[PDB]
Design a protein around this ligand. Structure first.
Ligand SMILES: *[C@@H]1O[C@H](CO)[C@@H](O)[C@H](O)[C@H]1NC(C)=O
Ligand SMILES: *[C@@H]1O[C@H](CO)[C@@H](O)[C@H](O)[C@H]1NC(C)=O
Ligand SMILES: *[C@@H]1O[C@H](CO)[C@@H](O)[C@H](O)[C@H]1NC(C)=O
Ligand SMILES: *[C@@H]1O[C@H](CO)[C@@H](O)[C@H](O)[C@H]1NC(C)=O
Ligand SMILES: *[C@@H]1O[C@H](CO)[C@@H](O)[C@H](O)[C@H]1NC(C)=O
Ligand SMILES: *[C@@H]1O[C@H](CO)[C@@H](O)[C@H](O)[C@H]1NC(C)=O
Ligand SMILES: *[C@@H]1O[C@H](CO)[C@@H](O)[C@H](O)[C@H]1NC(C)=O
Ligand SMILES: *[C@@H]1O[C@H](CO)[C@@H](O)[C@H](O)[C@H]1NC(C)=O
Ligand SMILES: *[C@@H]1O[C@H](CO)[C@@H](O)[C@H](O)[C@H]1NC(C)=O
Ligand SMILES: *[C@@H]1O[C@H](CO)[C@@H](O)[C@H](O)[C@H]1NC(C)=O
Ligand SMILES: *[C@@H]1O[C@H](CO)[C@@H](O)[C@H](O)[C@H]1NC(C)=O
Ligand SMILES: *[C@@H]1O[C@H](CO)[C@@H](O)[C@H](O)[C@H]1NC(C)=O
Ligand SMILES: *[C@@H]1O[C@H](CO)[C@@H](O)[C@H](O)[C@H]1NC(C)=O
Lengths: 414, 204, 369, 99, 49
């Protein structure tokens, strides 16, 4: 109160010094039952796999991409994400993702990077120098390798010009190495463009087959149909909480309710736009929202020139949220409840007043309007005054203010 | 040919419950007492969006196509009822100049005594659909009365549309406009009445 | 309670404190207005168990002991017919039950003791004699009441009956009180609806700005919502300061009609309702007061010939109180506000000068008793 | 930067002048009441109940005060009552006498 | 009467509507002030010839 008034002496009264506010006891986040997981497992667990000159692709869309199912798995001999850290991918969204996927020897996996050069990068699958997406790879000698050599996997050795970013070329066209004519068939200066690693179980790790998947992301004018999955908390009723239902943030005492939303409706609003209810997106009950309790805090005080005791009123607050006494004006703390009644010293509200009285303490009581008097009326009785008092009554009226004037140009600038 | 729309074609404007209240909103509604084009079929413009309705229980009105060309050069919505539920695709179909039913790609989905009413509108990459099915006692005109269409689907397809057509006995078509409407919600939170604020000085 | 916004709002300085100090000033005035209107009486007077008020029937305006609160019958009609974004409504200091104890005290004083409970301690007087001295205060001689007391009581009881029917017939009778409720509701709904507005910011949702943008870009958008919401509050507080000055001007008028019409008998023409004022009764209503102003209205005139003076033995006689009239041929003196003709006499009249001077004087006989 | 100080200081000065225009209307209403109390209570004898203090008004005296006026209202208060029996009229020779 | 400005003015919300509503309250009150002063009298009395 002394700080509120910028004074060391406080005169008798009731002073609002602060605002009370129940703080949110915990945070709630709620989204619908996590469903339509993106089908990455159809690629990473495939029996067959692509030759790198003719890589496989699938358009991943309209699904939740749980990248943590990928990056939590220590199975991957490489897991490089470009522009973004892998853990952040469970938060982000994209228009589509593509599983650009193939087999090569373990050494040539070094060519799978933004702006790389070499047989794979330039003649089979090119990544742009500013890529964004994840290169993922693992050793597949347990799947893609054969006694005497698996010659079915192929890479392009020869091309006349490099493939552009994400460009593809299946052609078996003969590489003409000079002025020598080739007529579409193999020969001297006329070499076949596709070649094999011939994978054998005896190979060293640089020659052993590796499976590769590059998760190519995109974001277009079309909406972000692929997103990292949102987690949900437990749900709380009859406590003040911070909350988020779908995209609707707030803070309040959530409760059950009898309101009957239509089957497509998600939020309730009161007359002046304020949210009054929400459907929980997992179990489709209607929660009432009411704000967390708040109100002015007022210090009831006799003057500091008479006592240092005070009593405190939490205006419009129930004592369960905060002698301790529940008035209709608010929870009142440090004032004695009294069954007598008196004239008002300090007003509290809703018929309550408080005063400093008898050992002396602050008391709070229902105010007295005056002494009751049954007037002695009867159809033949009159009272007549036998004497008088002249009485002099001081009445005080204000008549004029202090005459301020301001030069606004000197106040504003100077 | 044409008929008067009366008070048909209101739909729930947002996914929000409100009750015993009058709410004022601006959106692509069918204007009150506007003309609807009447048919027993031609390709039509789409503008900002379309109200469509029919007297139908034979299921001869099978579906719709939406796009610009409606043919091969670019993506095109196909929406069809398979006599069990709705089926949807958006691929660049090389389908006919006038297709009917006998009596790369980016999205796909699967779901008289009566009037069936629909609204289709496309905003910021979402194709909205709303509908209602209701009993009637009149053969020719739209039924003079009021009931509000409810959202079916909210399809995130990311496509541009300027024309549409119907895959084939009355049906009726009307373009939506950015009117202001005042909507009356009852205790159940249903829109039970509406006022078109532009219609006349009493409605203002 | 967004901390990013709250830290910016500190830079606007004392604006927020002077809004609360202004709204607190208005809140104290509402209790001061309510005190100055109703708390004019030093004691809680109460009516006797018997109701021998000379045939007048106050039952429709005295307290009902059976009601859940001690309001009168007409105060129940009046209480029936009027009908959290950091906002709090505060309760009044006097509850509606305490306001009904003051209207009871004012009314029970007025009925049992007349004007006297305003001037001092209440002095009992029989109600027919109180009405006789309220008649005598409007220039109608007191016998005009006592000779017509049953008629006057029946007209009063009937006129009180019409107030129930009038207040039951339409809520539009309480229009001034219901308007004062509707304006405060309209002002708060407008203050709350302004939270939905953008004020040129990217979004009107404060946590949404803090999600779309990084710190310095978000801060530049939040300062638009702070400016627009601060201007929205300054507009509301300015409008409530003007509306409270308008209600204080009305509360000072109600405190004056309490002091002058209820605690006394006004001679201020049309101040305490039309007609000559007899008395009035206060009844409470939500956010206001209702006065039932009882007034004498003169109602069945006759034309008479008149003269300013009469000659006798060359002396010009003038009426002491009242006016001369002719009953076609005979001459009489009557009181001014009610036809009660008497023979002209040396004690009905006084003499000045002689018949030469007065314009319009007539010749007659003054009877010397 | 200076346009932010000009905007804030100008809105700060508009807030002061608005509240002073409203406060001047409160003090004008009080000065018109005080001028009326001087015309009716001091220069006259008011019959307006409780206008010039409690009791029946005899006279009042103005005293000045800083920014105001103080009236010493002098009033008759009736002070020592007795109960009496009473009647509206007195019958004599079959005719009613009234006071 | 410029549309490019009017669309920005809508972003300030209810300020425009409450300014029109305040001045309409000023305007309607002037006829009340004039009725309260002069229309004290129930009939149009005439002086004799
Ligand atoms: C979510 O899963 C729970 C499992 O108990 C089930 O009760 C609930 O109906 C499901 N909700 C949705 C929207 O699928
Ligand atoms: C109030 O202050 C004055 C001056 O300091 C002092 O004389 C007086 O005793 C104080 N009041 C009480 C009740 O002590
Ligand atoms: C206060 O809060 C408790 C618990 O919420 C509740 O039982 C009680 O009814 C509330 N009201 C009062 C006046 O105690
Ligand atoms: C006040 O009154 C209540 C109800 O009669 C009673 O329970 C309580 O003991 C009383 N307290 C005091 C201090 O008189
Ligand atoms: C009247 O009151 C005065 C004091 O005010 C007292 O002296 C006097 O005796 C009383 N009685 C009469 C009849 O004067
Ligand atoms: C509206 O339709 C009616 C037929 O139902 C037609 O007579 C009228 O000309 C049409 N008006 C317009 C403006 O289309
Ligand atoms: C909804 O409509 C039904 C119709 O029978 C009615 O019983 C009910 O009271 C209404 N309100 C709610 C909230 O259900
Ligand atoms: C007073 O009026 C009420 C309602 O008209 C009536 O019930 C009551 O009996 C009346 N009292 C007397 C004493 O006539
Ligand atoms: C009084 O007499 C005149 C005679 O011309 C007449 O016009 C007028 O209506 C009469 N008024 C009453 C109240 O009888
Ligand atoms: C009044 O005048 C008429 C004739 O004008 C006369 O008959 C009557 O007796 C007189 N007295 C009364 C009391 O009417
Ligand atoms: C009264 O008025 C009439 C008409 O103006 C006139 O004839 C008559 O002489 C007047 N008498 C007096 C005494 O003024
Ligand atoms: C009144 O009487 C005197 C005689 O006593 C006479 O001269 C005079 O003319 C009379 N006046 C009238 C108005 O009749
Ligand atoms: C008058 O009579 C009443 C009857 O109850 C009594 O209380 C009172 O003391 C008497 N005297 C005076 C001066 O009022």
């Amino acid at each position: 109160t002394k700080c509120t008034l910028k004074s060391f002496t406080v005169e008798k009264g009731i002073y609002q010094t602060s605002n009370f506010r129940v703080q949110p006891t915990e945070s709630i986040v709620r989204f619908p039952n996590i469903t339509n997981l993106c089908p990455f497992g159809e690629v990473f667990n495939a029996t067959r796999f692509a030759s790198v000159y003719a890589w496989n692709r699938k358009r991943i869309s309209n699904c939740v991409a749980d990248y943590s199912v990928l990056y939590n798995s220590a199975s991957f001999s490489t897991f490089k994400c470009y522009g973004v850290s892998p853990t952040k991918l469970n938060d982000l969204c994209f228009t589509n993702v593509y599983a650009d996927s193939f087999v090569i020897r373990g050494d040539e996996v070094r060519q799978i990077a933004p702006g790389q050069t070499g047989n794979i990068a330039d003649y089979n699958y090119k990544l742009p120098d500013d890529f964004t997406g994840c290169v993922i790879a693992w050793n597949s000698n347990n799947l893609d390798s054969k006694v005497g050599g698996n010659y079915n996997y192929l890479y392009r050795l020869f091309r006349k010009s490099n493939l552009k970013p994400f460009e593809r070329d299946i052609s078996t066209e003969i590489y003409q190495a000079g002025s020598t004519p080739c007529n579409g068939v193999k020969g001297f200066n006329c070499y076949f463009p596709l070649q094999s690693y011939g994978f054998q179980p005896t190979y060293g790790v640089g020659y052993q087959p590796y499976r590769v998947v590059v998760l190519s992301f995109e974001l277009l004018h079309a909406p972000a149909t692929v997103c990292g999955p949102k987690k949900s908390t437990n749900l709380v009723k009859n406590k003040c909480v911070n909350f988020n239902f779908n995209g609707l943030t707030g803070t309040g005492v959530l409760t059950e309710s009898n309101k009957k939303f239509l089957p497509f409706q998600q939020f309730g609003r009161d007359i002046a736009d304020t949210t009054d209810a929400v459907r929980d997106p997992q179990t489709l009950e209607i929660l009432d929202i009411t704000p967390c309790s708040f109100g002015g805090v007022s210090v009831i005080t006799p003057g500091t020139n008479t006592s240092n005791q005070v009593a405190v009123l939490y205006q419009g607050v129930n004592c369960t949220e905060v002698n301790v006494f529940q008035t209709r004006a608010g929870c009142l703390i440090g004032a004695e409840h009294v069954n007598n009644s008196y004239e008002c010293d300090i007003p509290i509200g809703a018929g309550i007043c408080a005063s400093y009285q008898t050992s002396q303490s602050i008391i709070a009581y229902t105010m007295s309007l005056g002494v009751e008097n049954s007037v002695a009326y009867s159809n033949n009785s009159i009272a007549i005054p036998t004497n008088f008092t002249i009485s002099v009554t001081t009445e005080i009226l204000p008549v004029s203010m202090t005459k301020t004037s301001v030069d606004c140009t000197m106040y504003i600038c100077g | 040919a044409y008929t008067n729309s009366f008070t048909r074609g209101v739909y729930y404007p947002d996914k929000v419950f409100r009750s015993s209240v009058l709410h004022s909103t601006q959106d692509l509604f069918l204007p009150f007492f506007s003309n609807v084009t009447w048919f027993h079929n031609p390709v039509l413009p789409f503008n900002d969006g379309v109200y469509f309705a029919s007297t139908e229980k034979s299921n001869i009105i099978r579906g719709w196509i939406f796009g610009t060309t409606l043919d091969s050069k670019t993506q095109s919505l196909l929406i069809v009822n398979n006599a069990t539920n709705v089926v949807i695709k958006v691929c660049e179909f090389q389908f006919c100049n006038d297709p009917f039913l006998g009596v790369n790609c980016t999205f796909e989905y699967v779901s008289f005594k009566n009037l069936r009413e629909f609204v289709f509108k496309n905003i910021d990459g979402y194709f909205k659909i709303y509908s209602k099915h209701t009993p009637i006692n009149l053969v020719r005109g739209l039924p003079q009365g009021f009931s509000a269409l409810e959202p079916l689907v909210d399809l995130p397809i990311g496509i541009n549309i300027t024309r549409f057509q119907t895959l084939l006995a009355a049906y009726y078509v009307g373009y939506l406009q950015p009117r202001t409407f005042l909507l009356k919600y009852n205790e159940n939170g249903t829109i039970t009445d509406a006022v078109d604020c532009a219609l006349d000085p009493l409605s203002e | 309670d967004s901390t990013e916004c709250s830290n910016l709002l500190l830079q606007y300085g004392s604006f927020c404190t002077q809004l609360n100090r202004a709204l607190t000033g208005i809140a104290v005035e509402q209790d001061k207005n309510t005190q100055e209107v109703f708390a004019q009486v030093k004691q809680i007077y109460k009516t006797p168990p018997i109701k021998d008020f000379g045939g007048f029937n106050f039952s429709q305006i005295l307290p009902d002991p059976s009601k859940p609160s001690k309001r009168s019958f007409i105060e129940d009609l009046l209480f029936n017919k009027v009908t959290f974004n950091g906002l709090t409504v505060l309760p009044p200091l006097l509850t509606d039950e305490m306001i009904a104890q003051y209207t009871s005290a004012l009314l029970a004083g007025t009925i049992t003791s007349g004007w006297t409970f305003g001037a001092g301690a209440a002095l009992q007087i029989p109600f027919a004699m109180q009405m006789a001295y309220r008649f005598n205060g409007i220039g109608v001689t007191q016998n005009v009441l006592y000779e017509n007391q049953k008629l006057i009581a029946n007209q009063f009881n009937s006129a009180i009956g019409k107030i129930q029917d009038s207040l039951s017939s339409t809520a539009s009778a309480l229009g001034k009180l219901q308007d004062v409720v509707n304006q405060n509701a309209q002002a708060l709904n407008t203050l709350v609806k302004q939270l939905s507005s953008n004020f040129g910011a990217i979004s009107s949702v404060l946590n949404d700005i803090l999600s779309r943008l990084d710190k310095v870009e978000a801060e530049v958008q939040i300062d638009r919502l702070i400016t627009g919401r601060l201007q929205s509050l300054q507009t509301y507080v300015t409008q409530q300061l003007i509306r409270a000055a308008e209600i204080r001007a009305s509360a000072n008028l109600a405190a004056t009609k309490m002091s002058e019409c209820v605690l006394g008998q006004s001679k201020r023409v049309d101040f305490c309702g039309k007609g000559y004022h007899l008395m009035s009764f206060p009844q409470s209503a939500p956010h206001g007061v209702v006065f039932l102003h009882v007034t004498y209205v003169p109602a069945q005139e006759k034309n008479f010939t008149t003269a300013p003076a009469i000659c006798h033995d060359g002396k010009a006689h003038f009426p002491r109180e009242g006016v001369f009239v002719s009953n076609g041929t005979h001459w009489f003196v009557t009181q001014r506000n009610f036809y009660e003709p008497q023979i002209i006499t040396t004690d009905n009249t006084f003499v000045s000068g002689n018949c030469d001077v007065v314009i319009g004087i007539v010749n007659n006989t003054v009877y010397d008793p």
